[PDB]
């Protein structure tokens with residue numbers, strides 16, 4: 001028999017092969033950093049110094065023959081291609097007419113972006129996240145933000161994944177006009193310039209490749225030489241742990257929506273839809289696409305953009321075209337892909353899209369039932385209420401009234417029910433709507449008791465400016481505080497108020513607040529009671545479920561209340 005092959009581990013690159021080439025100690029254009037191959041190129045060097053070498057080799061993975069080739073004297077390189085990622089026990093055999101001889105087995109890894117080579121992620125979840133047996137039809141969604149791994153120190157293994165059906169990964173940018181990104185300051189706009197070098201306008205890219213796939217997380221077992229790292233390798237291992245979890249990239253958002261306004265031109269839609277197909281073929285752990293255009297018709301971050309006439313039909317065409325592309329991917333892969341969108345729910349946002357036409361292409365609409373009031377001006381109100389608060393004026397809720405100056409309201413007030421009823425009345429199916437919950441507050445200072453027109457209600461006061469605070473308090477920008485900051489600095493464990501704050505609840509609106517009458521600090525947020533109200537409301541109307549922005553800001557209380565308020569319910573999943 002031939003001499004048994006002896007595998008050269010070092011010069012077969014210790015048997016780590018990857019279908020994706022990712023650039024590692026550099027930051028460059030997306031097309032220079034990311035290259036995906038349908039088949040991994042496997043090159044394994046072996047030698048046979050004593051004896052006869054034979055004529056032909058065979059390579060086996062877990063005892064099944066996967067490749068064959070010619071022996072070349074004393075040193076051969078087995079070269080072949082392989083599609084399926086995984087961990088395999090490889091042996092190499094040399095054969096001639098006298099017989100065959102095989103190497104010792106050795107583990108080969110073929111990395112792919114579905115995480116087929118990875119073990120289930122080890123989790124490190126705050127134990128205040130409790131266990132529920134919510135029916136699997138109900139959507140329990142949240143957004144995980146790519147930048148949460150920095151100051152916020154919240155990583156994929158912190159997510160309470162057994163309590164989630166859908167994770168929206170925020171946010172994938174679109175190359176092109178992106179002036180709005182400069183409003184976040186820092187290196188965000190420059191990082192996008194770098195990512196888009198050599199990329200066509202209106203194609204998707206990864207905004208921060210360090211966070212997405214370069215950074216080594218010791219809790220995930222990453223080493224500096226591991227071929228896929230970052231949040232994306234953790235999401236691939238999370239999918240190995242929880243295979244029914246849907247992980248969806250969210251394209252756009254408040255700061256990254258400026259390129260959508262050029263989708264009035266079909267050529268730019270076609271460039272975008274092709275780039276998304278290519279993205280989902282590259283990053284196989286993703287299960288569809290979420291489009292967060294804020295907003296058709298304008299009123300987002302770009303004051304100079306928005307076309308009430310033309311953006312709606314462009315959004316509908318985009319959805320049509322994306323569902324054609326996703327059906328191509330379902331035919332190619334045999335998988336199911338979801339198409340979703342987060343939308344504004346103010347009447348002036350909903351009137352700009354004919355949702356009765358768009359929703360036929362969509363699996364779910366994530367209704368952004370939050371940010372109704374905030375520190376952008378000095379008018380207090382409930383940022384995430386279901387219904388109209390006691391602070392509002394006669395006829396403000398339905399929009400038939402006049403304001404304090406006698407001027408007509410232009411539409412119904414910003415509440416979750418006004419927006420959900422406007423979507424339902426035009427024929428959007430309840431079972432496609434997912435109601436949003438806020439894991440943060442918005443706030444003001446300067447709301448002192450003398451400014452209140454009703455002394456029992458701080459929402460009738462007037463502010464002097466935004467809430468101010470530090471990042472240890474969960475204030476990452478003025479006017480916005482993490483829920484877990486409100487719990488540590490304003491509520492306390494018994495929910496009865498600390499540090500000079502008092503708790504109140506508008507039982508008509510279904511909306512909580514904390515108020516420090518000394519400083520005039522007032523914060524509008526969601527809490528256990530108001531999230532139980534939203535789940536009861538979702539069960540009453542047959543909505544798909546609930547989602548939240550953003551998971552790093554919860555301490556478990558808000559996701560627990562999302563499950564508690566949906567207990568017992570089931571829903572028909574959209575077809």
Ligand SMILES: COc1ccc2c(c[n+](C)c3c4cc5c(cc4ccc23)OCO5)c1OC
Pocket residue numbers: 183254255371376
């Ligand atoms: C990226 O995170 C976010 C998420 C939502 C917002 C935001 C910034 N601004 C100014 C607003 C905002 C600003 C408004 C407004 C309404 C608004 C509603 C939502 C956001 O009325 C007029 O001024 C933001 O930060 C850049």
